[PDB]
Symmetry: D2
Subunit: 345 residues, 4 copies
């Protein structure tokens, strides 16, 4: 049993706001001065029910957003051009919703809706954009497929628009669907790519070149993470790269290349090896075991194929002490390993 709103005729006040919002939506002129609109909002929450004005605004927002779906059926459109079109649609939505939020600030801030479980105006916009644009199965699949394809291209050496990618993945975070839509597939595809890369390059390249490559990839993925992914992806991503390029090959690497690195006294590469293996569960342990093996095999070759035995031992001890000192950072475990291994001969 409500009161009559002060206005010249029924619905005058709401109409002004309807027209203002449509102007915002079509990017034309707002043909009222702003004070009048702020007042309109204040009157409509004072004499009528706030929850109703919110429903009215939600509806005209929904009508417009629903209408923006159609531009995304124009396939088979170029993948990048599609992603740009989604981004432009996202920017226009955000711009419009921020402006609407300014006009209706009183509604957002109202004491009566303190306790309401109705989303804020901004969040209401996000629900609508999620529900009607990005949740559509065809649009989502094409958007996510395009994002993943850009990352794949970059990992293969191509130049892409990282800025476009940042903007899209950031949209996915604002819509709270980054984890669901994008992240699991991204980690799946990263797992598949680096599993295959690990196995392929471990045949094609010698250990020193492989380790240099693994280091580059870890630095690259850090840079991807900093530049356009969400921080919540960091542990998973690095763990995946570490696992596929190092974890799966720890023993193979050592078997193929450790003897050569140690025989040939390759200090820089030995340092790198130790840094990389330090990143993975079991790494230093597996290294330490093969180190014991190398050291034991050398003593057997001294006693069997000796010009002087003491001198040959001293030379080896010096070389190996030095490697422990610089490449393995003075790690006591390697010193002990070595002393135990020496007692074998």
């Amino acid at each position: 049993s409500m009161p009559k709103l002060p206005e010249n005729y029924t619905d005058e006040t709401w109409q002004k706001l309807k027209e203002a919002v449509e102007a915002i939506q079509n990017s034309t002129s707002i043909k009222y001065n702003l004070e009048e609109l702020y007042q309109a909002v204040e009157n409509l929450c004072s004499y009528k029910i706030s929850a109703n004005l919110y429903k009215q605004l939600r509806q005209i927002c929904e009508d417009h957003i629903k209408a923006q779906i159609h531009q995304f059926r124009e396939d088979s459109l170029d993948s990048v051009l599609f992603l740009k079109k989604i981004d432009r649609c996202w920017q226009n939505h955000c711009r419009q919703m921020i402006m609407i939020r300014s006009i209706f600030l009183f509604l957002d801030r109202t004491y009566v809706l303190q306790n309401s479980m109705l989303p804020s105006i901004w969040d209401m916009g996000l629900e609508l954009f999620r529900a009607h644009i990005i949740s559509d199965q065809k649009v989502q699949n094409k958007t996510i497929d395009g994002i993943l394809l850009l990352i794949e291209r970059e990992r293969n050496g191509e130049a892409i628009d990282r800025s476009l990618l940042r903007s899209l993945l950031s949209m996915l975070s604002d819509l709270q669907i980054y984890q669901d839509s994008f992240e699991q597939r991204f980690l799946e595809e990263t797992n598949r790519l680096y599993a295959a890369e690990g196995q392929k390059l471990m045949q094609e390249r010698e250990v020193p070149e492989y380790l240099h490559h693994v280091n580059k990839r870890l630095e690259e993925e850090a840079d991807r993470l900093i530049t356009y992914l969400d921080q919540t992806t960091q542990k998973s991503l690095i763990a995946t790269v570490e696992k596929q390029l190092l974890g799966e090959h720890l023993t193979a690497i050592l078997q193929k290349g450790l003897n050569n690195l140690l025989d040939e006294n390759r200090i820089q590469d030995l340092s790198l090896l130790y840094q990389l293996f330090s990143r993975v569960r079991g790494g230093v342990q597996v290294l330490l075991q093969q180190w014991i093996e190398y050291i034991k095999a050398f003593g057997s070759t001294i006693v069997i194929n000796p010009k002087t035995m003491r001198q040959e031992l001293d030379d080896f001890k010096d070389k190996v002490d030095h490697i422990i000192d610089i490449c393995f950072l003075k790690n006591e475990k390697f010193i002990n390993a070595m002393k135990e291994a020496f007692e074998t001969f």
Copy 2:
């Protein structure tokens, strides 16, 4: 094996609350030497937690049951904090190596959730008991708020407060206050009803501060507001507003305005009845105007906080 056994015995001692028959240094060393160890620790943790389920089939008085859950929760926490101290090296190297395995502490929570609180019988009995204590409190009984704080806090730590407890809690609150609103609106005059509604809002604020989670705040207060005021706005004004205004009851009018201000449509419905009152009373004088204007100005000023909307309504009404 010798080394692992020491840690196995240590952990069992922690689990049975008996003596740790090694000096701590020796244990720290044992952990450092052994760095599978995580899986071994997980397993002996799981074995013990699984074994704690059986005490909850002995059903038993609701409060005694909740205390038994709380004790089990405290012992679990205590034990896991202590295990975590001994195995700190394992936690930190797992953290220094990027592992996707949960920390020791979190591993404990998954096990407690999975084996104790997730069980349908235990969960239903725990949540039923919590809800019963709140209901009893709302009825004027004294309960152990401390027990309640501790159990709800457990539900937050296990990350199941929203799922298990909160929806049922809001359901039960909705039911209780729906029925209270209808009952007391018949039994009590408006002044006494409004005083009561104010008490309930203050009480529920207190429950919230003292033992519930902040994420329950909006929902809870909105429910109390909706059921005690929102559903009765028009009936309250019809039953009591003419008397409050005729009799110049300023304190009650202030309270009315404060309460109605909290609820959708409240001030609006009040505003409309205000216009009605002024038109009717003003019509009876014209069929003295200064005395009425003074009375009315004073109510606007004190009870309605100088609200411009009521000043305008009144000026328009006087032009009748």
Copy 3:
């Protein structure tokens, strides 16, 4: 030049709440052109110019009318900044897409409002004094605009000066008011009425906290109320009222007493000790000066039943009180 002017005029329209006499597309384009060929500094400056100008109205004044004027100024500021943010969204986002240390447009606005309006010593003091006065009035029974208060305190939080400006003074004033209230009402009122009052105040302050204060104030506020109304009077309360509550079997009040004392350091402990004392004294008076109309056995059973019931309902079956009671009984049974 030409292009910047359009944006300067638009922003001035927003600031004076008049009409924006360009269509929005043209403005969005103007912002995009100006970044595609200092603009942030220019926008900061025209924002600052306007906000600076809003100080003058606060040199005039009734406390509530002053606070309303501050609130209006805050709402307009927010409204204007949100709208400016819409037009210049491209600038915000390509600052965010470029790693910049410059605050967002929105945050830039908050720095300016803090610096020019609320940070002024006279305006801040008058604002804080008014806020404190409204809370004091409310605590004294007066009806105030909670909505105004919520809005102003929430402004203080957005400007990140709630802890500095308001909260310490608020806790000081609360401490003072409840210290004096505790001492005054402990003289004026019997224990049952005092406890009922303390409970009301705790419920009230919970409500103030929920309704308009920041959650960070919760622990401090409730501890202060607890300390001044209960902590400072635990012994005096028991001395003045515990014998009457127990003699007269006042179960509701005993329940409340236990609930309240449970909230405070030393509370249950001091209660427990006086409980032991009561039982020893009362028990001794049964065995020494028995009532003629009961048998000795009946009198002792009656007392045991009364006491068991109090433990059970008022003290929540607390084992410590059961033990204290059994021990105490052996002093006479």
Copy 4:
């Protein structure tokens, strides 16, 4: 008047806990079964005041921590060995406090201290460690100097213990002094190093090699950030590297190398150039302006000074094709460069 605590004699109950804590502190045996200690804590909060038991525990914690300062006067000790000593001390502290926290869990969780402003047992331990060990001017300066030196060494190509560095910087975060003690100096030092590196390498190396180097450094610093620094350092750090290696040299890079990159058709390098300049305020704008200049200049030569080999229509088509291709691959089809080029073409 407080009640009498159930115990055989005054202070029996507290003594058990005092001995328990000392055992924890010296890493020896806890000579009571744990149940008895848990009970002791509960009794002391039930019959006596919680706040007092907390003060007592704080004091015996403080006494021990204060005593751990002296090992850090053994200078002039090797920087790494010092840092390892600080880390060991930090681990022991943490270990001891977690275990003390287990015994006194009831005290931490008590309802009466809900409203207390007293820090949790754990946080109490952090205040004490901060106040007595890491806050000491000599210890802090040596700790921070050593951390900064390890980073500097890493940037210069040496292998360091990143794990040690992660653990120490993480301690600094737990003690809430990462921003104060470390971060401002770290950004100062990073600013100084890369300002110098930018100026030095921009003389020593041609543009292609410089850009490749800058790219490496940005990838490296990302890796440092991920591996041992706090995330709150990310924006500042990258901005600094970007500013000193690219921002300060945008014009110089283009003036030294852009004509060559374009004349010689160096597509890979042009792609990298665009990616790097895209990271910096003004980057693409400055690149766009020089692009216009190149196209006007080269086009003006393609009409005033013809080649004998082709008609000049062919020479223009060859140039258009080259330039379209660069826009397409190096500049990612950027409309701004298409327009710039069309405008520039209308000049000749």
